Amino acid sequence: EQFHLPQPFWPTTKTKEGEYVPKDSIREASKVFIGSGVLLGGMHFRRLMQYKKGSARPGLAKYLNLFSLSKSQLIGFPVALGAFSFLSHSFANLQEGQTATGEFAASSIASLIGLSIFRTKKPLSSNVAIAVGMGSLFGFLTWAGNFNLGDNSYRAALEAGNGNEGGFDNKVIKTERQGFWEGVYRRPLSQTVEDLGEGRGIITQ
Amino acid sequence: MIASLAGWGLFGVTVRAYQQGIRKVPFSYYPLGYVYSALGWVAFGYGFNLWTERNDKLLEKRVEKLKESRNLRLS
Amino acid sequence: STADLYGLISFTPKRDIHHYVIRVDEVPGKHFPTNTTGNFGNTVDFENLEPRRKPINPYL
Amino acid sequence: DHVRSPNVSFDDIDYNNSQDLHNAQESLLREQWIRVSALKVCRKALESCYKTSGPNHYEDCREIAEKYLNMLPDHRIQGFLGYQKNDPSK
Amino acid sequence: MDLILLMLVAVGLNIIDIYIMIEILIMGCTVNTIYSASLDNDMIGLIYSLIQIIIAGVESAIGLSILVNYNRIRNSEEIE
Amino acid sequence: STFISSKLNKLVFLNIGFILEIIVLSWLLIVFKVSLLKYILLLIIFIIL
Amino acid sequence: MLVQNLIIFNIIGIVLLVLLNNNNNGILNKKSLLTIKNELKLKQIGLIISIINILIIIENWIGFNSNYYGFQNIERFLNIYWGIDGISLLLVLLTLILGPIAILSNWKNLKGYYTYYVISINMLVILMALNFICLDLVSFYILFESTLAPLFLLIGIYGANNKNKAAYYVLIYTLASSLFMLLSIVIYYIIINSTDYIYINNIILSINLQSLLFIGIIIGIAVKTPLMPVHTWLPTVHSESPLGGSILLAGVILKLAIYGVIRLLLPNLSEISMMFTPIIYIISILTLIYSSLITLKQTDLKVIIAYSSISHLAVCMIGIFANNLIGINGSLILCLAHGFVSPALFILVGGILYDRYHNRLINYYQGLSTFMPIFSIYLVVFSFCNTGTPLSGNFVGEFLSITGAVIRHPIIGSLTAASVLLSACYQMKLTNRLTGSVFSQYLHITNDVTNREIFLLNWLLIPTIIIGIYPSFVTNILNLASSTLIYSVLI
Amino acid sequence: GPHLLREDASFQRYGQLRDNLATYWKFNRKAARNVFIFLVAVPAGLGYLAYNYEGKTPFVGKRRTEPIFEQDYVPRK
Ligand SMILES: CCCCCCCCCCCCCCCCCC(=O)OC[C@H](COP(=O)(O)OCCN)OC(=O)CCCCCCCCCCCCCCCCC
Ligand SMILES: CCCCCCCCCCCCCCCCCC(=O)OC[C@H](COP(=O)(O)OCCN)OC(=O)CCCCCCCCCCCCCCCCC
Ligand SMILES: CCCCCCCCCCCC(=O)OC[C@H](COP(=O)(O)OCC[N+](C)(C)C)OC(=O)CCCCCCCCCCC
Ligand SMILES: CCCCCCCCCCCC(=O)OC[C@H](COP(=O)(O)OCC[N+](C)(C)C)OC(=O)CCCCCCCCCCC
């Protein structure tokens, strides 16, 4: 018998058992790593031609220097994203679906792999603090429901008959649990016991 | 309905009273000023109530159609 | 009553590529600047034109 | 004056009628406060017996002590949110 | 190739060189419209192209006027 | 905030080359598939450092 | 009547005070009569309005019925429905009573601009008083956040050496968190299409959606009643704000967060409140034990009282989340009793000592019972009340809150009993040091407590000991109101 | 008023330091040793006891169903 704790999670599209064909974790990271390497590598050479055309000009070198990537960054960035895409997809298959802790785990490690390359001359604690910080942002970005809840938004539930457009009533009790956005006047007591558990005033004293 | 224009006018007195402080003048300066600022907002207050009463008539009729549409949805 | 009225107004009907408002009140091509009858591909007849979809005024 | 409780149950009314729902909540509160008042009376009977019996308090105050320890868990204010929002039958 | 932003190497290092790139960029839009309009035998596309050429001219004149006054503003001693 | 704002202040400077380059980069958001947004979100966070 | 008379009169009073003071500004220098004696006439009109505000509510207290369940005195003003029930009535009474006392505390210890101060104090009191008598989450939030605008300016203008740090703390801590309370209020308006108290009390939500709304709201509450680890704003603001700002920020503002539980969590989120109550106890018990231990290592006089405020409010939250009438009534009596004892200490520490020696460091003060005996009688008397001595109103609140805590959870709720011991550690150490050994060699003999400062003390002690000796005055109002908050199904 | 307090230069430094310990604080291995104990170790330990017994203690009016005293005596001698 386990404990009863709250579940503060936004609704998600549940995948039926047997759904969720996994995606190639090697191939997916290969596209991002190779692709990002050519862009960052290609833009570097393009910015080198702009350096040759104008060097004595102060404003031109003022802006070109901002975009310049150190030799470590031109290598560290593609590796991190390639590591990020591999770990993000791999943890998606292990969980049978993308989760916040998977995205936290992928983002923090991938940052640590990347940060240890283009930020060598900094204490390892300084990197782990940054990598854990960047982990939280992807944990919260996934927990919040990506950029949009999509089908789980109240608008979608309302447009599907699962919203509170229909009012409430005490004489109509639903044996099954109500939807995420749905409200009711009265509930089956078995749902309260299966949530609160017996004890401190529920059923018994 | 005069009481509604009474409140709007009293808001007109406050703006002229609040104008005196910004200009840093005694609040009894140019007593005809309070009449002009009062009447200006009664003109606005008169029109504003006309606009809101017009909104009530329009919104009652629109809700008549929205209630019917919900019933078709709630079938 | 306020909760009812807001529930009516705040609701947004679903729009797909099947139902949406298009504000065209007539079929073009009745008269052209010149050579109105081209390759005779204008199968639309304006003498027996079916009624168009007039817009709904929800305040009327 | 002494207002009569509006004896009303959650199981016979429509919660859409928030006037009747109010009475169902007010009626379930008032009955509970009676049980505490009933409980405080029973405890008074126990106290007289123990003071009066002395050594015989275990005998002359046997069923009162038994009854008081039986009514104690349930003769307390519990509110109406428990029963309004839950359905024992289901 | 142009995904590495090669066109930035092809634009000179003067304000007047930016103005020309804007014209060459818009010129591509008009040529695209003339291409579609002629294939479709549609004169409405040719009306659009005529407007684009006329509007692209007014944009040049205002930009040059700002640039001209920008230039004389520095050379504004005129105390002789 | 002192670290973040010190980076953002360095970016606001009157320069045609800078603003033109930023705009053309943003055309990539129309080319890349939308599933690559989070990687661009990480790449942006890196160049802060 | 009530709110309409309470707003219209106060607005009229605020306009009247502004007209009188600013008339002479003009283009010429002015030496008028209203400036004489440090704006004394304008301070008096501010003090009368505070007294009149109390008379407005009493006009409606007479009509109150203790045997009626439901909101009374219901009225609609500004398209907002108001009303009073048992719990709200007493907190309104406390808020308005601290009006005259907050103004009287700062009678002659500001460098100037007394009219601005008097207007702000009466403005903050009205905003907080109105916060107990609204009947929707949106209007609750509006009044819950509007107090930042005067309080932020008041602390910045009239504060101590670190007033800029204190101003930047109250504004951001209490806004970056209450904005999380706005999100859960908004979601109530999206699914239910209404935020009215009664309408939302009857709806049950999915246990996942209950957990989200609770987390949002309790984030906004855990800052106002500072629970570790987000309490860092209160000690700083107290040590720097004006003395009158400290009386309101401790007397009332903290109790708005306990009233936040009564309206926003227990009735409508009853199922998820049961789940979080074990977690709430863990946070509050650790708040009780850590705040008491941290106080043992503090040096500023006015900070030391600030942390004592946190330990009591943790006990209040412990009691209110107990699912019985004993815990709820005890928590509310403690909030009322703390509402007088806490302001009294700041008067003793930041209002009587600080107005004579202008230094809050503890090292300078000892042996104060020699040349300031009347001060040391009240410091001793209020030290005991602050630590739950049985004859005060704090013991009734703490004993019941501890009793209710054990009833709800016998094992961990018993650790609330550490409040009786720890509260006597940091407090009695402070009093024993202040009134012990020889008189300090850094201070100079001066006046004892003045007649005004005695009046402030006597009328914060008198209500405290009435509630202690006969707490049934509070209870007879609370019982039917507090019995609607209990969630339990017994079969 | 008249500065009735003989202000001390050393007490002011002590008061200045004690109200500004945040500036000199570092997140060294010592702080993490303390930070882990107070923010995680204690809350989890109590958090387990709170949830373990949450509902397992029906102590209201608990009754006795087992004798206290012993009946027969079994001497060693
Ligand atoms: C003859 C060829 C000439 C040269 C060709 C190569 C040109 C050099 C440019 C680099 C190549 C990569 C970019 C090429 C176009 C962008 C990629 C694209 O269009 O999407 C296709 C590809 C995956 O496509 P796919 O999912 O298989 O589509 C079928 C689905 N059933 O999407 C991909 O994932 C491919 C890899 C792209 C990932 C790299 C970018 C990831 C993020 C790094 C940041 C890049 C810079 C950020 C700037 C953002 C500014 C806001
Ligand atoms: C592929 C080409 C290269 C990458 C281009 C990326 C284009 C998209 C960027 C969008 C914002 C435009 C920023 C303006 C252009 C910045 C160009 C740049 O990188 O300049 C470098 C600058 C700091 O320069 P510095 O490091 O001091 O000098 C380098 C010495 N070699 O570094 C910066 O100042 C960049 C940081 C600017 C602010 C970006 C932060 C955006 C917010 C992202 C975090 C959002 C977090 C929200 C939380 C929930 C989501 C996780
Ligand atoms: C130095 C001074 C400091 C401040 C002092 C306080 C001054 C208070 C003044 C009292 C005035 C009064 O009583 O206003 C009463 C009048 C009329 O009310 P009614 O007829 O019931 O209309 C219905 C009002 N309901 C809903 C309360 C019933 O409303 C007003 O004019 C409203 C003020 C104008 C607000 C701006 C909205 C209009 C512009 C729209 C562009 C966005
Ligand atoms: C119940 C709600 C009513 C609404 C009140 C609105 C405030 C506007 C008052 C203007 C009067 C004025 O500008 O006058 C100024 C007055 C009095 O200044 P003084 O000390 O006499 O003059 C000083 C100069 N001398 C002495 C040299 C002559 O100070 C005030 O303003 C105080 C109250 C407002 C401060 C906080 C405003 C925050 C607004 C947002 C709140 C949600």
Side-chain angles (χ1 to χ4, degrees), chain G residues 18 21-22 25 113 115-116 119 123 146 149 153:
Chain G
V18 173
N21 203 14
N22 297 113
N25 269 291
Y113 281 57
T115 312
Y116 185 98
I119 292 183
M123 183 172 301
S146 55
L153 285 172

Side-chain angles (χ1 to χ4, degrees), chain G residues 165 228-229 274-276 278-279 282 285-286 290 297-300 303 356-359 361 363-365 407-412 415 440-446, chain H residues 1-16 18-20 37-39 42-44 46-55 57-60:
Chain G
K165 197 178 68 169
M228 213 154 306
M274 305 268 292
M275 277 188 190
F276 277 93
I279 307 185
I282 304 153
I285 285 169
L286 298 188
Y290 294 173
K297 313 302 294 192
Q298 301 301 336
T299 55
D300 190 307
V303 169
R356 287 162 175 75
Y357 305 98
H358 314 105
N359 223 283
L361 198 51
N363 303 91
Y364 298 112
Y365 308 97
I407 294 189
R408 171 63 174 79
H409 200 302
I411 302 307
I412 188 188
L415 294 167
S440 192
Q441 307 294 338
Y442 311 88
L443 322 176
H444 288 293
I445 296 165
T446 179
Chain H
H3 285 167
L4 301 173
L5 193 145
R6 316 184 207 184
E7 181 177 332
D8 185 307
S10 286
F11 278 165
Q12 291 323 119
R13 260 202 325 278
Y14 182 72
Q16 180 77 28
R18 290 296 294 269
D19 298 316
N20 288 258
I37 295 171
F38 294 137
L39 293 184
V42 181
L46 298 179
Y48 201 93
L49 310 192
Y51 264 106
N52 178 26
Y53 298 85
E54 195 247 2
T57 56
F59 298 167
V60 170

Side-chain angles (χ1 to χ4, degrees), chain D residues 18 21-22, chain G residues 69-71 135 195-203:
Chain D
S18 288
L21 169 64
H22 187 269
Chain G
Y69 151 72
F71 295 108
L135 296 193
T195 56
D196 155 62
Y197 287 163
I198 298 291
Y199 196 91
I200 69 178
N201 281 8
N202 308 323
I203 309 299

Side-chain angles (χ1 to χ4, degrees), chain A residues 76-143:
Chain A
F77 290 160
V79 175
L81 311 171
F84 187 18
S85 190
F86 177 48
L87 294 183
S88 176
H89 286 83
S90 160
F91 297 155
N93 301 331
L94 304 196
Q95 300 267 28
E96 297 274 19
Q98 185 186 324
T99 52
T101 311
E103 289 292 321
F104 181 98
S107 310
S108 13
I109 303 174
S111 315
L112 186 58
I113 295 178
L115 245 141
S116 60
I117 294 182
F118 67 88
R119 289 245 304 176
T120 63
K121 47 193 169 183
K122 294 292 192 307
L124 170 70
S125 62
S126 169
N127 294 346
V128 175
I130 297 193
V132 159
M134 295 179 186
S136 70
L137 293 182
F138 284 91
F140 163 70
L141 158 64
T142 305
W143 175 88

Side-chain angles (χ1 to χ4, degrees), chain A residues 170-171 186-187 190 192, chain D residues 11 13 15 83 86-87 90:
Chain A
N170 33 282
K171 287 303 177 190
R186 192 161 199 175
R187 223 166 57 149
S190 27
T192 310
Chain D
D11 323 329
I13 71 175
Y15 294 13
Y83 191 82
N86 295 289
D87 192 348
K90 314 308 176 185

